Amino acid sequence: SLMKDTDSEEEIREAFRVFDKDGNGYISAAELRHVMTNLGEKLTDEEVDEMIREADIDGDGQVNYEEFVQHMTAK
Ligand SMILES: [Ca+2]
Ligand SMILES: [Ca+2]
């Protein structure tokens, strides 16, 4: 991976609804773990927790829309 072609926030809206499996508008550690396994990668409790605290801007433990966008587009 050199560069992902990030197509505005609209591509991130579609990405957000995959990564949120329950449809509440917050990505928890259970959801990010599940969707990583659906991508083919098996991530453990500790590794997903590292990615949740990495993506979550406010430190509540659940990654809503703005928190997911800022992390996705800058990374
Ligand atoms: Ca959710
Ligand atoms: Ca949060």
**Distance from the CA of 16 to the center of ligand 2, in angstroms?**
14
| Cα-to-chain-centroid distance, residue 36 | 9
> Which residues, 6+ apart, have CB-to-CB distance to 5 below 8 Å?
none
CA–CA dist 55, 64 (Å, integer): 10
Q: How far is the CA of 32 from the centre of ligand 1 (A)?
A: 9
Maximum CA extent, the chain: 32
Distance from Cα 60 to the centre of ligand 2, integer Å: 5
Dist CA 25 CA 33 (whole Å):
16
Among all bound ligands, the one having the nearest atom to the CA of 26 is 1
Give the distance (Å) from ligand 1 centre to CA of residue 21.
Answer: 6
Q: Could you give the angle at the alpha carbon of 31 between the alpha carbons of 26 and 33, nearest 5°?
A: 140
